[PDB]
Amino acid sequence: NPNEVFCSVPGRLSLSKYKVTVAEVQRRLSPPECLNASLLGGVLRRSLREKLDKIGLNNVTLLTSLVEGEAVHLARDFGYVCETEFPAKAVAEFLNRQHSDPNEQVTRKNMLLATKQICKEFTDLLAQDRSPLGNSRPNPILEPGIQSCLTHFNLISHGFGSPAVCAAVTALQNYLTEALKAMDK
Amino acid sequence: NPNEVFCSVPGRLSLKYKVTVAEVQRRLSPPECLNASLLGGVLRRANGGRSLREKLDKIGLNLPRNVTLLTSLVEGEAVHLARDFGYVCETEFPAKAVAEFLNRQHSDPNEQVTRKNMLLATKQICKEFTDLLAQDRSPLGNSRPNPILEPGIQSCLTHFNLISHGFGSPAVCAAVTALQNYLTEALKAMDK
């Protein structure tokens, strides 16, 4: 039963507990990570083999330590600070001022507009990711091939990866908006 | 002495980081102004509060007083996390498959020159943007380099450094590298 709560794990980055489903434990034990019982015990912040047995089951970065609930919370907080704290306005003022030739202003505007359109298409694809995460197994809308590659990035990052990429590209998009606004003045 | 080690803190994301007086002073000053309680948590100390306030007061840090998951991090682990994020952006993000997929949504032979000019513009605008983040000289760990940027933009990037404990600009550069790898794969694939 993939949505059974295997256990509840206190967050590593708090100043209470995330549920870890059997589906999440299975993602960790499967490729591409195939965590051993030593690494899985660290993730669960723990015999473990016996509890795996009953429900029926067998390159480390700092992201490998995360339960999916905390990985998603971390990405959400990164997105929040990218939106509310990144100084998109000052970055636009500074970079526009490095391109002051009145004869390059049309080219710069066109490059900024191209960049916004290309970045929006890229983050739209990442929003279409339907990788299983937490107790969720949404039905895919992307072709299986691309979805498979996005799922690979989900599994090595414990869900942090694609949302964190979108968070950063929102700081970039806010720069581009502020740049266009300032140029028009 | 800003580079005096205040204490050493075990990592929260391992399966110890030195904290300088300079780092503690960043936590106690605007924009965060952490109190004894939140600072105690950052330093992962087990009255603890009375002991911490004494230790601070003795090295000349004043402590009478929005918290994110980043607020929990010592600067050495924040920088390690951004480095690991950038590593998986470079080595694990499927930039090639993303390029193949997105190029196929624009297969009209008369739009190919426009799409290529849009991808080249994006690479150049993103490079200017990450070159600026590389020019950030925000104090971090035991480092206090001479700034090379204007003071105004450096104070704004420093604000982003302080709220993110050093994670923020490196992590933005990590993500934009994934984007840059997509753009390069999309150009390569179009020319084939």
UniProtKB/Swiss-Prot annotation, chain A:
Name used for this protein in its record: Transcription factor AP-2-alpha
Species of provenance: Homo sapiens (Human)
KW DNA-binding (keyword) present: yes
Ubl conjugation in keyword set: yes
Region (H-S-H (helix-span-helix), dimerization): 59-184
Superkingdom of this protein's organism: Eukaryota
Cited function: Sequence-specific DNA-binding protein that interacts with inducible viral and cellular enhancer elements to regulate transcription of selected genes. AP-2 factors bind to the consensus sequence 5'-GCCNNNGGC-3' and activate genes involved in a large spectrum of important biological functions including proper eye, face, body wall, limb and neural tube development. They also suppress a number of genes including MCAM/MUC18, C/EBP alpha and MYC. AP-2-alpha is the only AP-2 protein required for early morphogenesis of the lens vesicle.
Domain description: The PPxY motif mediates interaction with WWOX.
Localization, UniProt: Nucleus
Family indicated by similarity: Belongs to the AP-2 family.
Gene Ontology CC terms: chromatin; nucleoplasm; nucleus
Keywords: Activator, Disease variant, DNA-binding, Isopeptide bond, Nucleus, Phosphoprotein, Transcription, Transcription regulation, Ubl conjugation
Disease: Branchiooculofacial syndrome: A syndrome characterized by growth retardation, bilateral branchial sinus defects with hemangiomatous, scarred skin, cleft lip with or without cleft palate, pseudocleft of the upper lip, nasolacrimal duct obstruction, low set ears with posterior rotation, a malformed, asymmetrical nose with a broad bridge and flattened tip, conductive or sensorineural deafness, ocular and renal anomalies.
Major place of residence: nucleus
Interval of the full protein contained in this chain: 206 to 411 of 437
GO terms assigned for molecular function: chromatin binding; DNA binding; DNA-binding transcription activator activity, RNA polymerase II-specific; DNA-binding transcription factor activity, RNA polymerase II-specific; DNA-binding transcription repressor activity, RNA polymerase II-specific; identical protein binding; RNA polymerase II cis-regulatory region sequence-specific DNA binding; RNA polymerase II transcription regulatory region sequence-specific DNA binding
Modified positions (Phosphoserine) in chain numbering: S30
UniProt gene name: TFAP2A
From Swiss-Prot, chain B:
Stated consequence of mutating S29A: No phosphorylation
Domain of life of the organism encoding this protein: Eukaryota
Species, as recorded: Homo sapiens (Human)
Protein name according to UniProt: Transcription factor AP-2-alpha
Region of interest (H-S-H (helix-span-helix), dimerization), residue spans: 65-191
Function of the molecule: Sequence-specific DNA-binding protein that interacts with inducible viral and cellular enhancer elements to regulate transcription of selected genes. AP-2 factors bind to the consensus sequence 5'-GCCNNNGGC-3' and activate genes involved in a large spectrum of important biological functions including proper eye, face, body wall, limb and neural tube development. They also suppress a number of genes including MCAM/MUC18, C/EBP alpha and MYC. AP-2-alpha is the only AP-2 protein required for early morphogenesis of the lens vesicle.
Localization in the cell: Nucleus
Modified residues annotated as Phosphoserine in this record: S29
Subunit comment: Binds DNA as a dimer. Can form homodimers or heterodimers with other AP-2 family members. Interacts with WWOX. Interacts with CITED4. Interacts with UBE2I. Interacts with RALBP1 in a complex also containing EPN1 and NUMB during interphase and mitosis. Interacts with KCTD1; this interaction represses transcription activation. Interacts (via C-terminus) with CITED2 (via C-terminus); the interaction stimulates TFAP2A-transcriptional activation. Interacts (via N-terminus) with EP300 (via N-terminus); the interaction requires CITED2.
Coiled-coil segments: none
Domain notes: The PPxY motif mediates interaction with WWOX.
Clinical note on disease: Branchiooculofacial syndrome: A syndrome characterized by growth retardation, bilateral branchial sinus defects with hemangiomatous, scarred skin, cleft lip with or without cleft palate, pseudocleft of the upper lip, nasolacrimal duct obstruction, low set ears with posterior rotation, a malformed, asymmetrical nose with a broad bridge and flattened tip, conductive or sensorineural deafness, ocular and renal anomalies.
Shown residues within the full chain: 206 to 411 of 437
Family according to the record: Belongs to the AP-2 family.
